[PDB]
Design a protein around this nucleic acid. Structure first.
Lengths: 158, 924, 79
RNA sequence: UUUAAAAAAAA
């Protein structure tokens, strides 16, 4: 169902880019040291997994009367030390595990910019006459609602 | 018998104005306007509207039939203005409740001297104008409320809804019972048989009735087809109406090539629309789940600017503020807001009513630019769009699945193309693999369906009519636009029989006795051959002979495909299907997705395709088994098989041998022996006849056959004509009256007894069950909760498979109700009434009994909504219906003077009526 | 599915669904991790992970192979 | 170094 957006709670939830202290414990490295994967990551490049998410495909359908793919630049992931400059207090530990200093192409800016009938009285005989029920009055809600969007796209186009 | 004259009044181009008036009357021209016009409009009026206004200026009924958005409502507005100007009273009637609310808002903002009367609410009842659903009007008529006296005009809306087949009857009743002095105004979508309706009104009230028919629409339409698999839209129909055959054929060929070989097609279509500047779009899908899923898929676009987002947030918050804060915490309300923010909306019966109203308002104001709706939104008022898209052209009506009728397609597509702002409406139809070019052509080129009534008897109608005096149900049955159609048809059948008779007499035969004897003998031989073939086709005798090379002739009555080679056979489920390799027509082949098969036309050369025929169609199972290639996929091989069959035929110059049913198949049962004896005797008798050896007998035999055909046609036509000379449901009325008297409702003389008088009130659900249970004292002990739950069980009807378990209090009462229903079904059956007891008992679904009990206990709405699976919209609908039924039950208890039940139902109403379910509509 | 599946073997005992999902989601969207347990009630050395797109599966491997989790390398294999 | 498709609706 549309409102049943509980698929995102199979076991929990997380966010991209950020690093949790519990994750630091899991990896065996605290937060002071730069993550080791970053080394290999900056020796690999930008992950393609999130690339598809930020990529929008233009429909190729054409009108049979008788590609410059679009990317959402606001969805770019943040990977400090590879795409963004490493936060202060974290040196360029490229000598650990083997790596190189963050390159411009590895950096975020370069990658981003790269892209008869009976009478009525007879009827009412022997049966209870009809009575009005649920009598009520307008609360003016429609009036105020209409007042709110006084200048709407439809109205301004009128 | 009806006697009505249809004078075709001359009119300017665009409309066809014709008046049906009683035969003895003399047509006269309509007088021009007298005095100032009732109301003035800021824009010029197209011709047909002008003629309608002139017609209403003379207090003569009128039936406007034109495409919605052609501007029908202007006539109703003028009629209301005129009625108000003369201190009269008028009534506006609409089918649906929500449409009634919208119309009421429009009218109130127009004149401000307006009321409203529906089951849910009533506003300003003592108003010179009223808006009410048909049911309220029918209640007024049956109970003869004094308010009905002052009325002079009645404006029926969406009268084409009269063929609803469930709520259609309520129209006819209302039309029949009104006094003659009143004048009508009927607004309907374009329909072919409007003249019949006007004639019915004239004959029924004895006054002129006009008909204005116009197919003109303001902004043209262009119809494109999207095949499932293709990569483009083909302009199948242009605004000029010239159905482009070549483009349609190309689209269907692409469909076929894909079949025989943006993850979602709808996503591609909507994206293309967005980038082509067709933003305001209505996507029609005939399933709630489909609409939900498609809306969810599109949660990655945004058609709205930030300012529109702020406006939408403001409007949605203001609309929702009425509900309690606990209601605002519902997942449904919370989760739709993002969609509206980005410019996507949903509209189907499942949703909550308040959300539906809010989405309607937003769409009317243009904030939402892509709305996924079911068929219901089509009937909405003043919610057009620049484009309309059909996902699936298959809907499940009350009966079963079917292709959408051309009428529904026209009705929905009429909601495409605004006035002035956009000058080209676009309608796009998606077609899947299970589509045929013939079906597509019929759907696109078809016209509106004819208006055929659906009148059917109801116990409430019978009881009420019996109660009142100086009238009986026979009157209604006679005048209910159903006998009327048969009377209109009678002249056709009369002329048909007369013409057939005169032509049959015209035929000339040299000596009919001998020719007739010969023909009878020939027919008897044909019947005996049919019996023998029936003997052969017993599966246990012929199946061993249906080998993958056998050479059998298959001849379905009328159409014979000639010889063809068997390929395979199987037991389908217990008939047997044999797959032969016949010559097909290359037309049935192209549209084989729906067609069955057709013999190859003699002129052209067939395709030699495999046809799955039924076993008994095998006219003759010859015995020459061909050498089959063993791989019949490539089209080259099957032509080789055709050549082989031609060679085999050339080898046997005088007919291929056929298996002898007696010794080859080894049939032993004596019946075949006797049939053989009979056929031998008849053959000898035929040969010994003289005319058999005579020459030129072929033409004489042909004309004798045609004479016999015409004779049987005359017999059938006159039989059915005599059949049509009687009222149909009269037997049904007799059965209903028998049932009513058998249960004490009506005396043997057909005078309503107190039981029937009580049963008169209840009209929202079954009456006999409720009245019997009330009298049998079932309710005397149940607490308000159990009674409420049972009544809910009455008013629920939906395809639900949950079958929940009911623990203690919701079971026993249900079992007692089951016993009473079984008693009623048995009594009906013994009175010779068509009724299936099991189905009747299955109608009362208690699926919501537990839900309603919990809700009455005091549970919050979110709690119950999670207690089952039915969409919250259905729960709200059932709850409202149950509330009105409870009010009627209170009235019945008052009638029988049993204060206990009155108090119990008062408690029930008080408990189950609170914030969200009975949320006052924001249109008021 | 099989294209988007990827077996994980020799994972540390405390390695549960939450930590693996946290590790694997950062590189790209991942459907979920399957750990059919043995008759012990604790995570096995064997398990599987299913990603949203198979194109993401190699990159994770390209980025992760025998990484030091809980001071213990974890191997990853294909179908 | 690897476990069933199913719409719409009311006194």
């Amino acid at each position: 169902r549309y409102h049943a957006e509980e698929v995102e709670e199979r076991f929990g939830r997380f966010k991209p880019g950020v690093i949790s202290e519990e994750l630091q414990d899991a990896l065996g490295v605290t937060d002071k040291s730069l993550p080791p994967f970053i080394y290999r990551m900056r020796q690999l490049g930008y992950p393609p997994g999130w690339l598809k998410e930020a990529e929008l495909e233009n429909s190729g359908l054409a009108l049979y009367d008788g590609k410059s793919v679009t990317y959402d630049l606001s969805k770019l992931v943040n990977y400090p030390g590879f795409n963004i400059s490493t936060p202060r207090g974290i040196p360029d530990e490229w000598r650990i595990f083997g790596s190189i200093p963050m390159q411009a192409c590895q950096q975020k800016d370069v990658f981003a910019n790269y892209l008869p009938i009976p009478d009525m009285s007879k009827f009412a005989t022997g049966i209870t006459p009809f009575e009005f029920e649920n009598m009520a009055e307008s609360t003016g809600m429609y009036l105020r609602i209409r007042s709110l969007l006084k200048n709407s796209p439809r109205n301004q186009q009128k | 018998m009806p006697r009505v004259k249809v004078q075709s009044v001359e009119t300017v181009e665009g409309c066809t104005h014709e008046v049906a008036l009683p035969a003895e009357e003399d047509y006269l021209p309509l007088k021009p306007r007298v005095g100032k016009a009732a109301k003035e409009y800021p824009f010029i009026l197209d011709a047909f509207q002008r003629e309608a206004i002139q017609c209403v200026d003379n207090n003569q009924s009128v039936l406007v039939s034109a495409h919605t958005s052609a501007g029908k409502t202007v006539c109703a507005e003028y009629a209301i203005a005129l009625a108000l100007r003369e201190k009269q009273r008028v009534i506006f009637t609409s089918p649906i409740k929500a449409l009634s609310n919208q119309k009421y808002r429009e009218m109130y903002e127009e004149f401000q001297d307006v009321g409203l009367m529906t089951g849910d609410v009533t506003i300003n009842p003592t108003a010179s104008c009223l808006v009410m659903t048909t049911e309220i009007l029918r209640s007024m008529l049956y109970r003869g409320s004094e308010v009905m006296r002052e009325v002079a005009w009645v404006i029926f809306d969406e009268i084409h809804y009269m063929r609803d087949s469930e709520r259609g009857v309520v129209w006819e009743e209302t039309i029949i019972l009104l006094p003659d002095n009143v004048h009508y105004v009927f607004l309907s979508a374009t329909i072919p048989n409007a003249r019949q309706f006007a004639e019915w009104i004239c004959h029924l009230h004895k006054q002129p009735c006009h008909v204005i028919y116009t197919d003109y629409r303001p902004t043209p339409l262009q119809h494109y087809i999207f095949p499932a698999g293709g990569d483009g839209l083909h302009l199948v129909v242009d605004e000029n109406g010239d159905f482009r055959e070549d483009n349609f054929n190309t689209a269907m060929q692409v469909l076929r090539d894909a079949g025989d070989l943006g993850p979602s097609n709808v996503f591609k279509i909507v994206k293309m629309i967005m980038e082509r500047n067709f933003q305001p779009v209505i996507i029609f899908s005939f399933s709630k789940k489909d609409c939900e899923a498609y809306a969810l898929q599109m949660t990655k676009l945004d058609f709205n600017t930030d300012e529109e987002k702020k406006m939408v947030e403001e409007v949605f918050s203001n609309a929702i503020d009425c509900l309690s804060d606990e209601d605002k915490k519902l997942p449904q309300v919370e989760h739709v807001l993002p969609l509206l923010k980005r410019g996507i909306g949903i509209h189907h019966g499942g949703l909550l009513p308040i959300l539906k109203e809010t989405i309607e308002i937003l769409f009317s104001e243009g904030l939402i630019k892509a709305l996924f709706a079911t068929e219901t939104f089509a009937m909405g008022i003043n919610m057009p769009a620049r484009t309309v898209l059909f996902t699936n052209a298959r809907k499940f009506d009350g009966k079963d699945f079917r292709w959408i009728s051309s009428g529904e397609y026209i009705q929905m597509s009429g909601r495409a193309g605004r006035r002035g702002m956009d000058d080209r409406g676009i309608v796009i139809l998606m077609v899947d693999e299970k589509m045929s070019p013939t079906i597509g052509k019929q759907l696109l080129k078809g016209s509106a369906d004819p208006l055929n009534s659906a009148f059917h008897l109801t116990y409430n109608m019978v009881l009420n009519l019996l109660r009142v005096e100086e009238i009986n149900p026979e009157y209604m049955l006679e005048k209910s636009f159903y006998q009327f159609q048969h009377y209109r048809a009678i002249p056709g059948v009369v002329e048909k029989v007369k013409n057939s008779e005169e032509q049959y007499n015209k035929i000339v035969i040299p000596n009919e006795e001998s020719v007739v004897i010969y023909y009878k003998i020939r027919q008897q031989l044909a019947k005996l051959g049919k019996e023998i073939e029936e003997y052969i086709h017993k599966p246990k005798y012929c199946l061993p002979f249906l080998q993958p090379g056998r050479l059998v002739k298959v001849k379905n009555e009328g159409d014979d495909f000639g010889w063809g080679v068997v390929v395979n056979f199987s037991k389908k489920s217990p008939l047997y299907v044999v797959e032969v390799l016949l010559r097909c027509s290359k037309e049935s082949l192209k549209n084989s997705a729906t067609e069955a098969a057709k013999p190859a036309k003699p002129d052209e050369k067939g395709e030699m395709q495999v046809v799955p025929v039924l076993v008994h169609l095998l006219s003759a199972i010859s015995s020459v088994r061909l050498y089959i290639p063993k791989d019949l996929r490539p089209v080259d091989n099957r032509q080789s098989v055709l050549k082989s069959i031609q060679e085999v035929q050339k080898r046997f110059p005088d007919g291929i041998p056929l298996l002898d049913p007696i010794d080859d198949m080894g049939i032993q049962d004596q019946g075949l022996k006797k049939v053989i004896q009979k056929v031998e005797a008849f053959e000898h008798r035929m040969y010994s006849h003289p005319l058999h050896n005579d020459p030129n007998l072929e033409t004489v035999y042909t004309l004798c056959e045609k004479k016999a055909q015409i004779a049987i046609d005359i017999k059938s036509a006159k039989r059915e004509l005599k059949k049509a000379r009687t009222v149909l449901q009269m037997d049904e009325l007799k059965c209903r009256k028998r049932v009513l008297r058998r249960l004490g409702f009506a005396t043997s003389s057909d005078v309503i007894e107190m039981k029937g008088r009580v049963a008169c009130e209840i009209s929202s659900a079954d009456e006999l069950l409720l009245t019997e249970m009330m009298f049998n004292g079932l309710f005397n002990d149940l607490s308000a909760e159990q009674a409420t739950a049972l009544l809910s069980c009455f008013v629920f009807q939906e395809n639900s498979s949950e079958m929940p378990k009911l623990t203690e209090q919701l079971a026993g009462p249900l079992r007692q109700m089951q016993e009473c229903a079984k008693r009623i079904a048995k009594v009906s059956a013994e009175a010779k009434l068509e009724i299936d007891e099991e189905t009747y008992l299955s109608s009362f679904k208690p699926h919501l009994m537990d839900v309603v009990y919990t809700w009455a206990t005091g549970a919050t709405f979110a709690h119950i909504c999670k207690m089952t699976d039915v969409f919250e919209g259905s729960i709200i609908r059932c709850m409202r219906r149950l509330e009105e039924l409870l009010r009627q039950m209170c009235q019945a208890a008052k009638a029988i003077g049993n204060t206990e039940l009155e108090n119990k139902f008062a408690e029930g109403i008080t408990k189950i009526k609170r914030d969200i379910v009975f949320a006052a509509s924001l249109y008021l | 599915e099989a294209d988007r599946t990827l077996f994980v073997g020799n994972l540390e005992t405390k390695v549960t669904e939450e930590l693996l999902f946290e590790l694997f989601h950062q590189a790209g969207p991942v459907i979920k991790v399957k750990i059919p347990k043995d008759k012990d009630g604790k995570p096995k050395q064997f398990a599987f992970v299913n990603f949203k797109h198979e194109v993401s599966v190699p990159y994770a491997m390209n980025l992760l192979n025998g990484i030091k989790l809980y001071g213990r390398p974890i191997k990853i294999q294909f179908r």
